[PDB]
Amino acid sequence: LVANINGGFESTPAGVVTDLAEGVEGWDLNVGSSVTNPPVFEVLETSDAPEGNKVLAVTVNGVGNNPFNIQATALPVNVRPGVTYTYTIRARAEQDGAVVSFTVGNQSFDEYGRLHHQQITTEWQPFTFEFTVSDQETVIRAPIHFGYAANVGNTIYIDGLAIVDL
Numbered sequence: 001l002v003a004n005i006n007g008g009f010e011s012t013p014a015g016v017v018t019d020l021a022e023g024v025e026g027w028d029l030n031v032g033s034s035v036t037n038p039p040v041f042e043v044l045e046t047s048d049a050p051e052g053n054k055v056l057a058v059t060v061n062g063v064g065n066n067p068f069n070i071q072a073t074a075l076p077v078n079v080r081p082g083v084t085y086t087y088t089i090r091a092r093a094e095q096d097g098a099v100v101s102f103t104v105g106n107q108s109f110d111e112y113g114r115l116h117h118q119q120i121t122t123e124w125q126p127f128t129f130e131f132t133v134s135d136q137e138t139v140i141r142a143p144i145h146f147g148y149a150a151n152v153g154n155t156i157y158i159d160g161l162a163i164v165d166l
């Protein structure tokens, strides 16, 4: 029983994502207005996918004012107050030295936890942490942030997000 949906992108047809809000079920990809050189989001069919056949690729061509201005957010994430969850995801990048923050929070943008400013390498790694839903929310969000200046010119790949009751 996982709390998020389509965490490995397997429900989505391969291709460049043209509808950022609704093109990928289970995810919201929208880009901030300060980002003048838009990123490219692509669901890729690839043989080295960690799970299934597909991964999400994010190519960063430019940044805006804040790192959350290029982001992929899993939503809805269906939870229960007081319950401790395990977050697991796989990530790699085309070139060494990409930076990503993996976060979870509510619809008022309060965070329950994060893996902060993680270094991504050219080989798939798992990234994992635990968080507890500390308030009365039942529908929360899991924003991943890509808009760090270090990432300009790089492509970051993610797959296999699972948020599970501990």
Ligand SMILES: OC[C@H]1O[C@@H](O)[C@H](O)[C@@H](O)[C@@H]1O[C@@H]1O[C@H](CO[C@H]2OC[C@@H](O)[C@H](O)[C@H]2O)[C@@H](O[C@@H]2O[C@H](CO[C@H]3OC[C@@H](O)[C@H](O)[C@H]3O)[C@@H](O[C@@H]3O[C@H](CO[C@H]4OC[C@@H](O)[C@H](O)[C@H]4O)[C@@H](O)[C@H](O)[C@H]3O)[C@H](O)[C@H]2O)[C@H](O)[C@H]1O
Pocket: 028, 030, 066, 067, 068, 069, 071, 073, 101, 108, 109, 110, 111, 116, 141, 143, 145
């Ligand atoms: O304990 C957390 C703390 O850890 C420190 O180490 C770190 O330095 C802090 O940044 C961090 O604080 C938390 O930051 C995140 C954003 O974090 C990124 O931004 C800062 C970077 O330095 C850092 O590396 C990144 O991790 C905040 O989440 C964001 O909150 C804002 C709301 O703006 C304010 O509201 C609450 C207040 O606590 C914040 O300080 C203040 O900025 C949201 O901003 C809104 O975004 C939406 C668009 O949302 C969509 O895209 C982005 C994605 O997050 C979101 O899920 C999508 O739905 C716009 O409509 C609004 O214009 C804009 O206001 C951010 O979405 C949200 O991620 C934490 O609130 C903060 O505690």
Ligand SMILES: [Ca+2]
Pocket: 008, 009, 010, 049, 050, 051, 052, 053, 054, 055, 159, 160
């Ligand atoms: Ca997959």
